[PDB]
Design a binder for this molecule. Structure first.
Ligand SMILES: Nc1nc(=O)c2ncn([C@@H]3O[C@@H]4COP(=O)(O)O[C@H]5[C@@H](O)[C@H](n6cnc7c(N)ncnc76)O[C@@H]5COP(=O)(O)O[C@@H]3[C@@H]4O)c2[nH]1
Lengths: 184, 184
């Protein structure tokens, strides 16, 4: 299936490459680049899995209570004949009642944008119904892989979520914080 | 299928982002960074598609007549909540008789590595026969997308090839050169 392929691609070409080095990058940040006066960046990559595959490029905007602080130091490697391919991750602050309640490495799972685009382009032959189904299958497949992965499950948290189309005003920062605080 | 997904992702998350900016990066390179006394980098992205999905990370140190010269200037952008995501491409020299016969921006299509890894891991349920089949379907799907692409079919050349397992002698540099020279 499409989701099976994207989930393995996301593991093989990214997660298994970055997650075993992520701890050291975050420690290195917290010791040398982090504001002296602020809380340490939490450990683990937090991965946002919107099942409707709505993935903005600006996470900082879009949500008032989630703001970009800084980048982790880059990770570089040679991959597929590209010298020094760069993998970068961004640090965000999470707000609760107008003040910082948490700080973490946070991003959307990029392959969900692929499922979104594919539902948009006619040549892909991929419907909006297929997209939801493939989204859930992506997340499941990804959870199964991470469950027996050495490149651990324990350096990331998957945050899957649905926003109501019946409109009950969803809170993304509270979702992260919920996951963040399970780790405290 | 797996290959359908990977081909769309390769387009959506990479080719449609970089190919429309590639002509300008290569000009920038040729005018301001290229060695004074050397031939200009040719235009277009040259993409290696080995159907057996054998993708070394070092193309330079894997073929005697293909050697790394330099990097193009980086392209940066915000993507899926990652600030300043970096897309980088490498310039290689193509040798014919110990003579530089060509200079081009060259790399392997990264998703073929995914297909390879999947055939290696038990939990992917993906056989080596499935890999060859999916490889070819990947290349065809990619050719079909690029054909209607208002993005670039014009800024890239797809180089699909198969290495004879009966051990004739395949020349990668010559294969590239035959593509590079089939222009002017
Ligand atoms: N979030 C995030 N940050 C990254 O640095 C990153 N690098 C890869 N990925 C995601 O991992 C998975 C595997 O990556 P791969 O390189 O095999 O395929 C990539 C690769 O063939 C190509 N691509 C993307 N960026 C590059 C790149 N910088 N250089 C070469 N190819 C690239 O286009 C495919 C799809 O891109 P994405 O849709 O961003 O998602 C990828 C993918 O689902 C990333 N995801």
């Amino acid at each position: 299936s499409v989701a099976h392929g994207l989930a393995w691609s996301y593991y093989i070409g990214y997660l298994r490459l970055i997650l075993p080095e992520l701890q050291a990058r975050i420690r290195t940040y917290n010791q040398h680049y982090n504001n002296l006066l602020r809380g340490a960046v939490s450990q683990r990559l937090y991965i946002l899995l919107p099942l409707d595959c709505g993935v903005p490029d600006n996470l900082s905007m879009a949500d008032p209570n989630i703001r970009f602080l800084d980048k982790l130091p880059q990770q570089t490697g040679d991959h597929a004949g590209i010298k020094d391919r760069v993998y970068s991750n961004s640090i965000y602050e999470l707000l609760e009642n107008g003040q910082r309640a948490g700080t973490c490495v946070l991003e959307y799972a990029t392959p969900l944008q692929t499922l979104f685009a594919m539902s948009q382009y006619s040549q892909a032959g991929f419907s909006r119904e297929d997209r939801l189904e493939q989204a859930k299958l992506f997340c499941r497949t990804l959870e199964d892989i991470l469950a027996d992965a050495p490149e651990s499950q324990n350096n990331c948290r998957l945050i899957a979520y649905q926003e109501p189309a019946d409109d009950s005003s969803f809170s993304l920062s509270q979702e992260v914080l919920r996951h963040l605080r399970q780790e405290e």
